[PDB]
């Protein structure tokens, strides 16, 4: 098997720049390297085939070079629409292998998450269910870790998390985390905390609430 590796999963470059994505292959691929793009649509078009240098039916702003084991794509004038995921692939041996892809993101300056805790609502409490939700909005970069504390500790069990793709207008990131408990356990404790660890502060951001302060 031939391993296709692409350093930099997330490449940061500002609109205008000439981005260059890299691809390495576990062996001499003999110039049978192809590049496929993928919009957030999920659609994937062919860009450059045969060890780069070969245009299919795309804008001329896309190109490749390399040989041996190392290949690179190129985007001379980074376009807004070029914010996608790029996969290199080899056509030298079976089975066919693709790289891990490289997704692009934009220039944004460090932001720090705005965190928000929300106790369960009357309504969900009456149906006998409890879900504690916390929000981490518009931060940068996208690296971020959340931790829940019930009355001061643990709780891994029951946490569900989701992150947004970069934002259309501002180039930030957002995350939602949900700790979901039974109505009976929930009421057994007073304080709930949402602690966010981001590369924007050494001190974890903290937000909480006391069941009897509502």
């Amino acid at each position: 098997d031939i391993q296709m590796t692409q350093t930099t999963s997330s490449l940061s470059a500002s609109l205008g720049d000439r981005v260059t994505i890299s691809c390495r292959a576990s062996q001499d691929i003999s110039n049978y390297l192809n590049w496929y793009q993928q919009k957030p649509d999920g659609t994937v078009k062919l860009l450059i085939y045969y060890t780069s240098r070969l245009h299919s039916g795309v804008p001329s702003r896309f190109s490749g070079s390399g040989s041996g084991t190392d290949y690179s794509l190129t985007i001379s004038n980074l376009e807004q629409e070029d914010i996608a995921t790029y996969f290199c692939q080899q056509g030298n041996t079976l089975p066919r292998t693709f790289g891990g892809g490289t997704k692009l993101e934009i220039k944004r300056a460090d932001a720090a998450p705005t965190v928000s805790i929300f106790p369960p609502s009357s309504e969900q409490l009456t149906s006998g269910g409890a879900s504690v939700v916390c929000f981490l909005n518009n931060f940068y970069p996208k690296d971020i870790n959340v931790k829940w504390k019930i009355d001061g500790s643990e709780r891994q069990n029951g946490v569900l998390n989701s992150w947004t793709d970069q934002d259309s207008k501002d180039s930030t990131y957002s995350m939602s985390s949900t700790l979901t408990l039974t109505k009976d356990e929930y009421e057994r404790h007073n304080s709930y905390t949402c602690e966010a660890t981001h590369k924007t502060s050494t001190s974890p951001i903290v937000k909480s609430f006391n069941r009897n302060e509502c």
Binding site: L46, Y49, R96, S116, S121, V133, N137, L160, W163, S174
Partner: protein
């Protein structure tokens, strides 16, 4: 113009089977080969096999081999792929593509939109909608963030809008996550503290599969 147009059954119990259609138009179906690539929700592109409609037959990627059967029908210019033993790790989007030759060897020039497959045992289930307000009284004094929780539904998708859509700025709709065979997602919104509660903030979530239309206004308190 060339075009691979696909589809087939898309939501099936685990242990079941599926047949995906890949329809080729714009060229002569026996002059090229088709390939099927797998892509689980967590990125990465997985090569499966390659059927050659012409010098007839195949070649599978060890791993899909044995669970995957590649066939085609020349007359209808349609290639097919079939997954047996469907399990959960198979729930993914499948594309088909045409391989051209040119110096050296092959490369994929045209891709189908890809048929999505979702291996579940779930049952169409409406979503519960709950309001998400500040909570412990203490604002965020300046602007305020409110949300809307949508829990326990199936299948996807879900439509979330605020004030019928009048509220468009400062809105984050998070991808749904699979709690227990059901999906759950939430949507936050942000408005100055001068609006809410003073001014009304309402999320309009919808779940077509269950003919569920709902409007949960965001009032204060618990």
């Amino acid at each position: 113009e060339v075009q691979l147009q696909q589809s087939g059954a898309e939501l099936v119990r685990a242990g079941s089977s599926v047949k995906m259609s890949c329809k080729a138009s714009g060229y002569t179906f026996t002059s090229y080969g088709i390939n099927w690539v797998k892509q689980r929700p967590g990125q990465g592109l997985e090569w499966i096999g390659y059927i050659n409609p012409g010098n007839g037959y195949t070649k599978y990627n060890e791993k899909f081999k044995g669970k995957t059967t590649l066939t085609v029908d020349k007359s209808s210019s349609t290639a097919y792929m079939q997954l047996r033993s469907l399990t959960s790790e198979d729930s993914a989007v499948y594309f088909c593509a045409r391989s051209v030759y040119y110096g050296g060897s092959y490369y994929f020039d045209y891709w189908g939109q890809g048929t999505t497959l979702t291996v579940s045992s779930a049952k169409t289930t409406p979503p519960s909608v709950y309001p998400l307000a500040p909570g412990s009284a203490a604002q965020t004094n300046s602007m305020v963030t409110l949300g809307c929780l949508v829990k326990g539904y199936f299948p996807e998708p879900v439509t979330v809008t605020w004030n019928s859509g009048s509220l468009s700025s400062g809105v984050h709709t998070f991808p749904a996550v699979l709690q227990s065979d059901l999906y759950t997602l939430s949507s936050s919104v942000t408005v100055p503290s001068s609006p809410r509660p003073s001014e009304t903030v309402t999320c309009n979530v919808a779940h077509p599969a269950s003919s569920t239309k709902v409007d949960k206004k965001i009032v204060p308190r618990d």
